[PDB]
Amino acid sequence: DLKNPYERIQAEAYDAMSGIQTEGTDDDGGGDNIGWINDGDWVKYERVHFERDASSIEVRVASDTPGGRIEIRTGSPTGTLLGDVQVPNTGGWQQWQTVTGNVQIQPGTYDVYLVFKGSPEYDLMNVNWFVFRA
Ligand SMILES: O[C@@H]1[C@@H](O)[C@H](O[C@@H]2CO[C@@H](O)[C@H](O)[C@H]2O)OC[C@H]1O
Ligand SMILES: O[C@@H]1[C@@H](O)[C@@H](O)OC[C@H]1O
Ligand code: NA
Ligand code: NA
Ligand code: NA
């Protein structure tokens, strides 16, 4: 039941969420993505174990709007910001690209939250999976 942050974590495999819905993805490899993402929404992945320090996160994203950002926090949706990732317009809801952002995460087991932020006026993005790099 521990998750491995150094291999892809599928975004739909969350343990709790606020604000979002899942759908089948047209990204290569098929599977699913989370979507209907708005400013202040989040997803929680429990028991993410880091054996060594993480220095960045890579996220597979799509957006038909101006996009937004993903904040990486632990413990709760308000927990200390460990890094963020900018998500641009990608040309459509199933036009997928990989983006990256720096993080600083020390070894330990965490409840990881991705908290989505941007304009309140439009849905922000879709996310297929994410993975950390050491
Ligand atoms: O996650 C995506 C949803 O956000 C998307 O919903 C659209 C949001 O933008 C609006 O301008 C559209 O009316 C609305 O349907 O649907 C696709 C899904 O991948
Ligand atoms: O352009 C491609 C798009 O059609 C989808 O499959 O997501 C991956 C992209 O490279
Ligand atoms: Na939402
Ligand atoms: Na960043
Ligand atoms: Na996925």
CATH number where 24 lies = 2.60.120.260
How many other β-carbons are positioned within 10 Å of the β-carbon of residue 80? 9
Query: Who's near 39: CB < 8 A, 6+ residues apart?
Result: 68, 116, 117, 118, 119, 120, 124
Q: How many residues does the chain have?
A: 134
- Residue range(s) defining the domain that contains residue 111: 1-134
- In the chain the first and final C-alpha atoms are separated, in Å, by 22
Experimental method: X-ray
User: What domain count does the chain have?
Assistant: 1
Provide the 3-class DSSP secondary structure of residue 122. coil
Distance CA 25, CA 31 (A): 6
Q: Check pocket membership of 26 for ligand 2, CB cut-off 6 A.
A: yes
Spatial distance between the Cα atoms of 109 and 30, rounded to a whole number of angstroms: 29
Distances in Å between the Cα of 61 and the Cα atoms of 57, 82, 89, 107, 116 are 12, 19, 9, 26, 12
User: Does the annotation list 96 as a binding residue?
Assistant: no
Q: What is the resolution of this structure in A?
A: 1.6
Ligand 2 pocket mutation pick from 23, 25, 26, 99 by most atoms within 8 angstroms of CB: 26
With the CA atoms of 10, 12, 132 and 99 taken in that order, what torsion angle do they form, in degrees rounded to the nearest 10?
A: 100
What whole-number distance in Å separates Cα of residue 2 and Cα of residue 4?
Answer: 7
* Closest to 63 measured CA to CA, from 15, 128, 115, 8: 128
Indicate whether residue 58 lines ligand 2 (CB < 6 A).
Answer: no
CB distance 100 to 59 below 8 Å:
yes
